[PDB]
Amino acid sequence: TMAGAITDQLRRYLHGRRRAAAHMGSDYDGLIADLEDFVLGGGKRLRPLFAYWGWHAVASREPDPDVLLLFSALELLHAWALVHDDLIDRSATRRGRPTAQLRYAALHRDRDWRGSPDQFGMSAAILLGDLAQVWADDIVSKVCQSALAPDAQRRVHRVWADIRNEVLGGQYLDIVAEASAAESIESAMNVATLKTACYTVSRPLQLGTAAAADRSDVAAIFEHFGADLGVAFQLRDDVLGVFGDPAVTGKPSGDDLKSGKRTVLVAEAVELADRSDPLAAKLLRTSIGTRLTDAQVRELRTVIEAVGARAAAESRIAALTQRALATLASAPINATAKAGLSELAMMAA
Amino acid sequence: TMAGAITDQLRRYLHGRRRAAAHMGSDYDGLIADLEDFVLGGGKRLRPLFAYWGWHAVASREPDPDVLLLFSALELLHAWALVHDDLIDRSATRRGRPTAQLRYAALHRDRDWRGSPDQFGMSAAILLGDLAQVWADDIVSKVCQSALAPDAQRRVHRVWADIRNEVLGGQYLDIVAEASAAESIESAMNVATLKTACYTVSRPLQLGTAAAADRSDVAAIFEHFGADLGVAFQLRDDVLGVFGDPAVTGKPSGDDLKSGKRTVLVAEAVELADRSDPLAAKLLRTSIGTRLTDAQVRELRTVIEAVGARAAAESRIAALTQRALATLASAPINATAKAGLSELAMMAA
Ligand SMILES: [Mg+2]
């Protein structure tokens, strides 16, 4: 499959960088090995696949192996995003396994090392995320020099600068929204647009289009396609974060309410409750982002259901997915890319 | 001066990126403004100046303004290193001014925001350092495509990949050495070579040489030059970190011992004490990295001086600086670069 060919390019790149850095000792080599296990650990490779279909949409032939490596840089970049995300969220586990700060703090305590184990774990986690960022970037620099004409080089860099600027802005806007208790739907839609629409769908699509051809028409359509599908992805995640199966999602029931996320679903519930039951709106406003018992959480989830927020989210997802498919159907791109992107928009739900 | 022209290129670059990111709101704009304030806050511009003399050594003409912007990328990269360093060290101030995590925790309290102000400060500081890194790299990508021939592009990327790989390895090796109580002079020499020799002198020099010409002979000589002068810089800092006047250094008296650093000075003191005062060696071994009173610190400083570690460090600094100037005198480079590098090696030492 295409995800495996993209992943194999990344495995060979990481293996080469690791070997070339072996003179720095076995401790740094162990950190690189940790990065290999996290990045290559397995997944759908959603963002590199969006880059492929963006290339397929405006290209005739298949990309060179080095261009597949360019698409894989989005996977290495995502490791940077997730590792620093786990520090910002103070998450203990990811996919059932301990986060980086916990793995290195436990290593500190197993070795009977001195100083604070938790300080070492956070410091090592910062550096682990930093390494993924500089190496994901080094891929783009290396592939641009070796496999791309200078015009494709300039188009690729401008997408690469935007996607890293937008995911950093999205991260900061999110912690500001949670700290300031931003209630509005517009605030949550802004974060979802930067974090999910731009970072996961639109900009990956434009990376493959930029590497293939000078098609500003298609890049603008993919931005409109990603703005609808990306928000649909976020709302699905928000619904699952409140009402989903914990054994499936990996997070407890009502986790978003537990953690105090400022989702569109939450913002929509406060707005609907303002019109239907002001006392339910006051319950939501004073409970979100606080330490909630299991009973308080079940009550908040039911109130979100009672005022129609979940039903409103489901129709949002249906409408956005339908328009995104309509934008895809009438796009001046190869029909084979229209099939794979409708496939991917469904395989990724 | 040359530092001002380099700084002006960075200020104009940062102003452009800030304006182009204005659509992301006033909160993210305040983070970028804080980045401008920190990077442009003032300094020697030591690392961009090393890059200039590396260019001057093998070039005929002066660099174009865009190449000065390439040299300024080292200053933006240094903000990434310092911001994340302040998090790794849990430092509260830097040169008398609060660190990033403290500035953003104060913003959180000023706004009466929700959650932990210190957790917000650490998260914002992580993102701030991440932003400096991606924008420092966006400079290198932008200048390479627009102002450099493809061969110079490839030489510049190789140095850019090495300097960020080596400062990350030096950071991890340092926290591992402190946590594992690495006593050897070799371990401290390895960290000082990566953190100071490579990162501050050698690689910046090679960045300017790479941007100017294909001179493998000069790049290898600057590596030998930086390996001596860079360690001499660190040994001077280590002596000042233990014996320096707080009015001159700006740091407390005996700060390195208070902070528990694994310096060559401390490593050499343990080795010298093993020969002359074995019980003083045990006092050093069991006190470095612990909570020390002001009397314990004064006691350790006197022991370090008594066993001759301070005098050994002074002769190391003298020998390394003398050999570095001898390597500079016999280098196949322009004599004007030989003068500026001897002057630059003096203004810093
Ligand atoms: Mg680049």
Side-chain angles (χ1 to χ4, degrees), chain A residues 1-43 45-250 252-345 348-349, chain B residues 1-157 159-247 249-250 252-342 344-345 348-349:
Chain A
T1 76
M2 266 287 89
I6 288 167
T7 292
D8 187 71
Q9 288 298 317
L10 186 48
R11 166 177 344 258
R12 284 161 182 281
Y13 174 81
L14 291 175
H15 176 82
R17 295 301 307 264
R18 174 169 180 194
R19 221 209 272 271
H23 63 283
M24 284 195 237
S26 62
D27 295 297
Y28 192 56
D29 177 74
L31 181 121
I32 296 162
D34 293 334
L35 179 58
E36 289 179 318
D37 190 46
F38 182 62
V39 169
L40 299 174
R45 318 300 181 198
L46 185 73
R47 302 185 177 58
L49 279 185
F50 274 126
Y52 173 85
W53 292 119
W55 163 286
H56 206 96
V58 294
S60 52
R61 36 137 205 130
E62 289 303 288
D64 292 354
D66 274 356
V67 172
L68 290 191
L69 178 65
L70 173 64
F71 300 160
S72 84
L74 289 169
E75 197 76 8
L76 193 49
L77 190 72
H78 195 55
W80 154 71
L82 293 181
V83 166
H84 283 186
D85 215 5
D86 283 338
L87 283 163
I88 291 171
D89 286 335
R90 284 169 56 80
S91 298
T93 66
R94 171 173 285 284
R95 291 264 101 220
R97 335 195 104 65
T99 51
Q101 58 268 41
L102 262 57
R103 171 184 47 254
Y104 290 108
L107 166 62
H108 186 285
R109 283 192 306 262
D110 280 356
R111 299 257 174 81
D112 180 36
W113 280 353
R114 74 194 38 201
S116 170
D118 286 309
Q119 185 180 351
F120 176 80
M122 160 212 85
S123 298
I126 293 170
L127 297 170
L128 179 66
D130 284 354
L131 178 63
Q133 191 190 68
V134 307
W135 279 11
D137 282 4
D138 288 348
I139 291 174
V140 175
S141 288
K142 163 159 199 282
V143 171
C144 281
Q145 267 156 39
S146 77
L148 294 179
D151 284 344
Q153 286 183 31
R154 186 177 334 111
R155 294 187 305 259
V156 161
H157 164 59
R158 277 161 128 271
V159 172
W160 190 249
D162 281 344
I163 197 181
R164 279 138 68 255
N165 200 27
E166 280 163 346
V167 78
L168 282 172
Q171 283 169 296
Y172 189 63
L173 262 61
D174 209 5
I175 67 177
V176 166
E178 294 185 7
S180 68
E183 288 186 357
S184 73
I185 292 169
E186 194 193 7
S187 177
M189 278 294 303
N190 287 349
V191 169
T193 297
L194 289 173
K195 269 197 181 181
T196 310
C198 299
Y199 170 70
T200 304
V201 186
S202 296
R203 299 298 189 201
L205 280 170
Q206 287 171 346
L207 181 69
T209 305
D214 182 6
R215 295 290 305 279
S216 71
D217 56 318
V218 172
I221 287 143
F222 279 157
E223 178 156 332
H224 189 96
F225 171 76
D228 284 343
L229 179 69
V231 169
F233 284 172
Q234 191 54 64
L235 300 180
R236 177 52 64 218
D237 285 350
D238 297 349
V239 172
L240 289 170
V242 170
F243 293 114
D245 193 343
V248 177
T249 64
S253 268
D255 183 46
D256 295 2
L257 301 172
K258 274 315 297 271
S259 70
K261 295 196 178 220
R262 291 288 172 172
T263 60
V264 168
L265 176 63
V266 155
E268 182 140 52
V270 165
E271 209 176 85
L272 288 168
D274 269 340
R275 295 158 30 197
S276 75
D277 188 344
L279 297 186
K282 162 271 146 183
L283 172 69
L284 288 165
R285 280 195 179 87
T286 61
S287 299
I288 291 163
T290 64
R291 298 170 56 190
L292 301 167
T293 73
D294 295 351
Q296 290 177 269
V297 164
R298 277 196 303 285
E299 184 175 70
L300 281 187
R301 304 168 65 250
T302 303
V303 171
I304 289 163
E305 182 94 57
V307 308
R310 179 176 191 180
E314 287 293 346
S315 59
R316 267 170 197 288
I317 293 162
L320 295 160
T321 308
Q322 220 311 297
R323 183 166 64 167
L325 288 176
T327 302
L328 189 59
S330 71
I333 64 180
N334 303 344
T336 37
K338 295 190 201 207
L341 275 172
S342 321
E343 262 282 311
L344 193 52
Chain B
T1 67
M2 192 34 67
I6 289 166
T7 292
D8 184 57
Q9 284 296 315
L10 186 46
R11 157 178 316 111
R12 291 202 334 94
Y13 175 80
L14 289 175
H15 177 85
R17 297 304 304 273
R18 176 170 176 195
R19 291 289 119 150
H23 65 283
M24 295 201 256
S26 61
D27 294 300
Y28 191 57
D29 175 75
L31 179 123
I32 296 158
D34 180 56
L35 178 62
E36 292 178 317
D37 183 74
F38 182 64
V39 180
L40 299 175
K44 305 61 54 184
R45 316 298 184 215
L46 190 56
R47 298 181 185 62
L49 280 185
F50 274 124
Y52 173 75
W53 293 125
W55 164 286
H56 196 95
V58 297
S60 55
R61 36 112 181 171
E62 285 304 284
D64 294 351
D66 273 358
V67 174
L68 289 193
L69 178 63
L70 173 64
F71 300 160
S72 86
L74 291 168
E75 196 76 3
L76 195 47
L77 190 72
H78 194 55
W80 158 74
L82 292 182
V83 166
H84 282 187
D85 208 17
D86 285 335
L87 284 162
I88 293 172
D89 285 339
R90 307 195 163 155
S91 296
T93 63
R94 169 177 281 287
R95 299 313 280 181
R97 296 173 141 57
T99 54
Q101 58 267 43
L102 270 278
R103 297 196 301 275
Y104 289 91
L107 168 70
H108 188 283
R109 298 200 191 80
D110 280 357
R111 300 269 197 289
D112 190 43
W113 275 350
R114 303 202 197 163
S116 171
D118 289 310
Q119 180 52 208
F120 176 81
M122 160 193 104
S123 296
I126 290 167
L127 299 178
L128 177 69
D130 283 352
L131 180 63
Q133 197 303 310
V134 304
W135 280 11
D137 182 85
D138 287 345
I139 294 178
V140 177
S141 290
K142 190 222 181 253
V143 174
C144 279
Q145 271 154 18
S146 74
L148 293 179
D151 289 314
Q153 288 182 31
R154 173 176 282 200
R155 294 187 306 258
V156 161
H157 158 68
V159 179
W160 191 248
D162 278 345
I163 193 180
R164 281 136 70 255
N165 199 26
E166 281 163 348
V167 81
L168 283 175
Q171 282 279 62
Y172 191 63
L173 262 49
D174 208 13
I175 66 179
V176 168
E178 292 181 4
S180 70
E183 294 175 5
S184 77
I185 293 175
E186 193 167 59
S187 174
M189 275 297 285
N190 286 352
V191 169
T193 295
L194 289 173
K195 272 203 179 177
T196 308
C198 299
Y199 172 68
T200 305
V201 186
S202 293
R203 299 308 193 195
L205 280 168
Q206 289 172 343
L207 177 77
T209 306
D214 180 10
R215 297 291 305 277
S216 286
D217 53 318
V218 179
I221 275 177
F222 278 159
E223 175 147 350
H224 188 298
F225 171 77
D228 284 345
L229 180 69
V231 173
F233 284 170
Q234 191 56 64
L235 294 186
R236 175 53 65 217
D237 287 341
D238 295 349
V239 169
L240 289 170
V242 171
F243 295 113
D245 184 357
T249 73
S253 196
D255 188 46
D256 289 4
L257 304 173
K258 297 163 51 53
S259 63
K261 303 190 127 73
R262 290 291 172 173
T263 61
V264 171
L265 180 60
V266 156
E268 182 144 59
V270 164
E271 205 180 84
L272 285 171
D274 269 342
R275 210 258 209 180
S276 75
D277 306 69
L279 281 195
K282 197 207 307 183
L283 173 70
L284 286 166
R285 282 194 176 86
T286 62
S287 299
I288 295 149
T290 67
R291 194 70 64 92
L292 300 174
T293 74
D294 280 7
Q296 279 167 310
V297 162
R298 278 195 305 283
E299 181 173 50
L300 290 184
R301 303 166 63 243
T302 299
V303 166
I304 287 161
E305 190 146 20
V307 304
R310 181 176 184 170
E314 281 295 347
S315 44
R316 278 173 180 280
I317 294 164
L320 288 177
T321 308
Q322 169 266 311
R323 180 161 57 120
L325 291 175
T327 298
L328 185 58
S330 71
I333 67 174
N334 307 157
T336 36
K338 274 175 217 193
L341 276 176
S342 326
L344 192 50

